[PDB]
Structure 1
Amino acid sequence: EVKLLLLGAGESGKSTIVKQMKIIHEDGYSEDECKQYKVVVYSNTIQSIIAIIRAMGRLKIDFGEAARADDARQLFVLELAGVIKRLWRDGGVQACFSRSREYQLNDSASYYLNDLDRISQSNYIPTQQDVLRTRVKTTGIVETHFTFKDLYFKMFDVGGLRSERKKWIHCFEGVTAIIFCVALSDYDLVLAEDEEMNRMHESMKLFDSICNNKWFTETSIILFLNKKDLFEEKIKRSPLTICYPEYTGSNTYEEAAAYIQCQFEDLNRRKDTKEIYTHFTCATDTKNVQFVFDAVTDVIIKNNL
């Protein structure tokens, strides 16, 4: 038996790792299970374009074309596919999209919006990647059972937000391993529950709590520096100094990623006693998560000999 906790702040990728434990270790989502996510894909798409439009007021951004004003009114009341397309391709809308760190926008927004033709067909069935990309908040615990290398994994997914903290204390008993997820792409983002709080500082202070807690003295601490794909893209246009004003390295994936790893690993106040097992991950990439989780399982076996 292995008790495994998926921890981390809101939107860090926890439940996406949980989706991967289905497909990687099992037959995975059925066409019928995929079909159940259609209304979520639609909602995520609609809510994302609404969020961008709404932000255009806060940001003092006009539509590229005046005709989009009526499309925006139509969008709020709601042909829908046409309206979303025209808005998404507008230059004002795109200027706002480019500045999404100044508001709250789902990571999968452009994923879906760029695939609007496909997802809007009457016969649309979400693909497995479409499912992995969905955003559904996780409130309460999500204990699921899986068996890897013949280990009986008892896995606990929990809410990452600060409102969901109350559930965390009940699950702390007998934890073999924690996978602590950190969204690499959050250095320049603010919390949805606190827009004067940077997301990466929030993830540090929790990791300071979770790594140094006396409950997890013998627990294997695994750090997933997640959303590596989004980070690779973002780092070329948003400087790391937003998060770490002292950083004098390059705004390149390898250097900036390495620096973040160092900042998190430095939070370990028992370095001559305890390892952190760090992996760079893309939680939506099945091949990557399978490889990383295999490695993680080996660490857990080796640490329970």
Structure 2
Amino acid sequence: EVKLLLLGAGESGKSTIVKQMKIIHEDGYSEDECKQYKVVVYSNTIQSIIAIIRAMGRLKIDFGEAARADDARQLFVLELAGVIKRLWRDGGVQACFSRSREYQLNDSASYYLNDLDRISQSNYIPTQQDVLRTRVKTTGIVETHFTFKDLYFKMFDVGGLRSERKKWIHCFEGVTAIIFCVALSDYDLVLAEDEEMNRMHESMKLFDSICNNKWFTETSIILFLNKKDLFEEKIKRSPLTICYPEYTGSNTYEEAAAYIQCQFEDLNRRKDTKEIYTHFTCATDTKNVQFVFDAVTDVIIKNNL
């Protein structure tokens, strides 16, 4: 038996790792299970374009074309596919999209919006990647059972937000391993529950709590520096100094990623006693998560000999 906790702040990738434990270790989502996510894909798409439009007021951004004003009114009341397309391709809308760190926008927004033709067909069935990309908040615990290398994994997914903290204390008993997820792409983002709080500082202070807690003295601490794909893209246009004003390295994936790893690993106040097992991950990439989780399992076996 292995008790495994998926921890981390809101939107860090926890439940996406949980989706991967289905497909990687099992037959995975059925066409019928995929079909159940259609309304979520639609909602995520609609809510994302609404969020961008709404932000254009806060940001003092006009539509590229006046005709989009009526499309925006139509969008709020709601042909829908046409309206979303025209808005998304507008230059004002795109200027706002480019500045999404100044508001709250789902990571999968452009994924879906760029695939609007496909997802809007009457016969649309979400693909497995479409499912992995969905955003559904996780409130309460999500204990699921899986068996890897013949280990009986008892896996606990929990809410990452600060409102969901109350559930965390009940699950702390007998934890073999924690996978602590950190969205690499959050250095320049603010919390949805606190827009004067940077997301990466929030993830540090929790990791300071979770790594140094006396409950997890013998627990294997695994750090997933997640959303590596989004980070690779973002780092070329948003400087790391937003998060770490002292950083004098390059705004390149390898250097900036390495620096973040160092900042998190430095939070370990028992370095001559305890390892952190760090992996760079893309939680939506099945091949990557399978490889990383295999490695993680080996660490857990080796640490329970």
TM-score category, normalised to shorter length:
over 0.9
Q: TM-score when scaled to structure 1?
A: 1.00
CA distance in 1, matches of 2:91, 2:79: 21
Q: Per-residue displacement from partner, 1:198-240 (whole Å, max 9, x unpaired)?
A: 0000000000000000000000000000000000000000000
TM-fit CA distance, 1:192 = 0.0
The corresponding residue for 1:11 is 11
TM-fit CA distance, 1:249 = 0.0
TM-fit CA distance, 1:255 = 0.0
Question: Which SS does the other structure have where 2:92 is aligned?
Answer: helix
CA distance in 1, matches of 2:240, 2:80: 38
Question: Which SS does the other structure have where 2:143 is aligned?
Answer: strand
Question: Which SS does the other structure have where 2:144 is aligned?
Answer: strand
Q: TM-score when scaled to structure 2?
A: 1.00
Q: How does 1:147-296 map to 2 (within 5 A)?
A: 147-296=147-296
Q: Per-residue displacement from partner, 1:106-135 (whole Å, max 9, x unpaired)?
A: 000000000000000000000000000000
Question: Which SS does the other structure have where 1:129 is aligned?
Answer: helix
RMSD: 0.0
Structure 1: 5+ residue stretches without partners: none
TM-fit CA distance, 1:9 = 0.0
The corresponding residue for 2:84 is 84
CA distance in 2, matches of 1:135, 1:19: 12
Q: Per-residue displacement from partner, 1:93-152 (whole Å, max 9, x unpaired)?
A: 000000000000000000000000000000000000000000000000000000000000
Aligned residues: 305
Q: Per-residue displacement from partner, 1:167-202 (whole Å, max 9, x unpaired)?
A: 000000000000000000000000000000000000
Structure 2: 5+ residue stretches without partners: none
CA distance in 2, matches of 1:219, 1:6: 13
CA distance in 2, matches of 1:206, 1:128: 31
Q: Per-residue displacement from partner, 1:2-58 (whole Å, max 9, x unpaired)?
A: 000000000000000000000000000000000000000000000000000000000
Q: Per-residue displacement from partner, 1:38-94 (whole Å, max 9, x unpaired)?
A: 000000000000000000000000000000000000000000000000000000000
CA distance in 2, matches of 1:238, 1:220: 33
Q: Per-residue displacement from partner, 1:236-275 (whole Å, max 9, x unpaired)?
A: 0000000000000000000000000000000000000000
Question: Which SS does the other structure have where 1:87 is aligned?
Answer: helix
CA distance in 1, matches of 2:159, 2:18: 13
Report sequence identity in percent: 100
Question: Which SS does the other structure have where 1:35 is aligned?
Answer: helix
Question: Which SS does the other structure have where 1:97 is aligned?
Answer: helix
CA distance in 1, matches of 2:12, 2:46: 22
Q: Per-residue displacement from partner, 1:258-297 (whole Å, max 9, x unpaired)?
A: 0000000000000000000000000000000000000000
Question: Which SS does the other structure have where 1:92 is aligned?
Answer: helix
CA distance in 1, matches of 2:166, 2:115: 38
CA distance in 1, matches of 2:265, 2:238: 23
CA distance in 2, matches of 1:282, 1:218: 27
